Design a binder for this molecule. Structure first.
Ligand SMILES: C[C@H]1CCCC(=O)CCC/C=C/c2cc(O)cc(O)c2C(=O)O1
Ligand SMILES: C[C@H]1CCCC(=O)CCC/C=C/c2cc(O)cc(O)c2C(=O)O1
Lengths: 263, 263
C-alpha cells in the first residue's frame, strides 16, 4: 500500500513522489539519475520495519520531468536541498532520517549542514569530490552519445548487472532520457560544491558509506575526510547503487542506522 | 651494476638477495609470495636516482628456500622484522627507507615500531588486517589446489595481467611452489598481528598506500587507521603489486617519498 502521486511545489517543479508506511520518517534521495523506481524493493522492506518512507524522482528527471530548467542546471547539493526542503514542507514531513548516493549524498550533507532541524540523521553514500576520467567530457557531447556512454557507465557501476537490467525497459527508457540532462547539469558543478567542510559535518549524526567493490581511488577522499572528522564511516556491499544491487542489505542498513537515533 | 647472490645469516637462512646503486639505502621487501624478481624493473629506476637498493626472496620462498622451517611458519610482521634486521646487520645497512606490501607492509610497521633506529621512513602498502573470503580456507586444501587458486587470485589482484604474465616462466614456476608454503604460514597469523596500534605508528615517518583499483573494502581499514593517526595516506596505481603493474610510477613514489627525509 504505497501512495504514488504528484505535487507541484512553489518553485514550479511538478514532482512525482511515493510514500509507504507509518512511523518515523525516512527519505530516500536518489542518485544523479533521479529515478526513484530504483528504491521500489527496499522501500517496502524499510517501511515494514515501522517507518514512513518517502521517495521521489528528482527535478527534471523521469516522472518529475515537468520542472523549470534551472532546477536541473548548475546543480549543487545545496540547490537540491532547497528543493527537497520545499517538498518536505508540502508533504508534511518535519524531520527525517535521510539517505542519498552521489549527488543525493551531496544533498544529504547540505541538509545536515544548512537544515539540521529537519534531519534526524544523515546517510551519505559516495559523495562526489573528484570525478573519474570517464566523466571529464560527458557534457561536451550530444544526447545520443551521452545516453550510450552513460548507460554503459551506469551499468558498469551497478554492482550487479543482472539486477540493473532487471529494473526493466520502462525504467531504462526513463533513464535514457535522463542521461543527457544529468550530464549537462550535474558533473561540472556537483563536486566543487561538495559540503564536506568541517562546519558542514557536525550538526547532526552522520553515518557515511562507500561501496565495498568500488575502486578505492574513486571515493578515497570521503574516507579520509570522515576519519579525520570523527564521522562514522564504512562500506556497503556493491558499488554505486546498493539499493539496486543489494536491496536487502541496503534496507537493513537504513533501518539499523536510523533506529539508533530514535528516541 | 646489479649484484645477485646468496648470504647465510646466523639464523640459518640462506638468503637470495640483490643490490644496485650507491647512496642512501632503500629496502624493498616483497609481499607474501616472497619473490624479489618482481622488483627488477623498479629497482633499476630507483637505483639510478642515487640510492643503494636492496631486495631479496623471503625466507623459505623462491631462491631463499634453504631456510629453517621455523622461518616460514606462524609468520607475523614482527617475526619477519627480526629476520630482516639480522640480514641488514650482515649487509651493513644501518638505516633505510623501507617498502613493503601485504606481509611486507606488516614487516615495515614492525620495523617502525620495534626497530625505529633502522628506519629512515616506512612505506607500507596494503597491510592485511582482515582477510577477504577467498583466503578463508586456503590453508585447508591440497597443494595443487592452493597453487591453482592462489595463482588465479594473484593474477586477479595484479593490477595488470600482461605485466603479471610477463614476469616470466621462471618466476611463475617459483611462485607455484611458494603458494602452499605461503598458505600454511601467512594468512592465519599475519592479520591478527598487524602492528597498527597507536604505539606502533609514531616513531618514524610513515607514508602509507593502497591500490587505486583495489576494491575499497579490502584495505578500507588501512585508510581509516592512517587518517585517524595523522599519517600520510594515498593511493598508487594498480592494485596489490604496483611494482609489477606500474614500475615507473612505483619507482617515482619510492624516490620522491624517500627524498623528503634525507638531510
Ligand atoms: C549518475 C550516478 C551514476 C553514473 C555512473 C557513473 O559514471 C558513476 C561515476 C561516479 C560518480 C558520479 C557522479 C558524479 C558527479 O560529479 C555528479 C553526480 O551526480 C554523480 C552521480 O549522481 O552518480
Ligand atoms: C601473497 C600476497 C599476494 C596474494 C593475492 C591475494 O589473494 C590478495 C588478497 C589480499 C591479501 C593478502 C595477504 C593476506 C594475508 O593474511 C597475509 C599475506 O601475506 C597476504 C599477502 O602477502 O598478499
Amino acid at each position: 500500500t504505497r501512495t504514488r502521486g504528484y505535487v507541484t511545489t512553489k518553485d514550479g517543479i511538478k514532482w512525482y513522489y511515493e510514500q509507504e508506511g507509518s512511523g518515523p520518517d525516512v527519505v530516500l534521495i536518489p542518485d544523479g539519475l533521479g529515478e526513484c523506481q530504483m528504491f521500489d524493493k527496499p522501500m517496502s522492506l524499510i517501511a515494514s520495519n515501522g517507518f514512513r518512507v518517502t521517495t521521489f524522482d528528482m527535478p527534471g528527471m523521469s516522472r518529475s520531468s515537468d520542472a523549470p530548467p534551472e532546477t536541473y542546471q548548475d546543480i549543487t547539493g545545496r540547490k537540491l536541498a532547497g528543493y527537497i526542503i520545499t517538498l518536505l514542507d508540502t508533504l508534511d514531513i518535519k524531520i527525517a532520517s535521510v539517505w542519498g548516493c552521489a549527488s543525493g549524498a551531496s544533498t544529504v550533507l547540505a541538509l545536515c549542514s544548512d537544515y539540521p532541524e529537519r534531519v534526524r540523521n544523515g546517510m551519505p553514500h559516495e559523495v562526489p569530490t573528484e570525478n573519474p576520467d570517464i566523466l571529464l567530457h560527458i557534457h561536451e557531447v550530444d544526447p545520443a552519445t551521452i545516453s550510450q556512454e552513460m548507460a554503459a557507465n551506469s551499468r558498469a557501476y551497478s554492482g550487479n548487472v543482472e539486477a540493473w537490467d532487471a529494473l526493466g525497459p520502462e525504467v531504462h527508457a526513463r533513464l535514457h532520457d535522463n542521461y543527457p540532462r544529468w550530464a549537462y547539469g550535474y558533473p561540472r558543478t556537483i563536486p566543487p560544491s561538495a559540503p564536506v567542510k568541517t562546519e558542514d559535518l557536525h550538526k547532526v549524526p552522520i553515518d557515511w558509506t562507500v561501496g565495498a567493490s568500488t575502486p578505492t581511488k574513486l571515493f578515497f577522499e570521503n574516507i579520509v575526510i570522515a576519519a579525520r572528522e570523527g564521522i562514522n564511516i564504512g562500506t556497503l556491499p556493491g558499488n554505486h547503487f546498493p539499493y539496486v544491487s543489494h536491496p536487502e542489505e541496503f534496507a537493513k542498513y537504513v533501518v539499523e542506522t536510523s533506529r539508533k537515533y530514535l528516541k
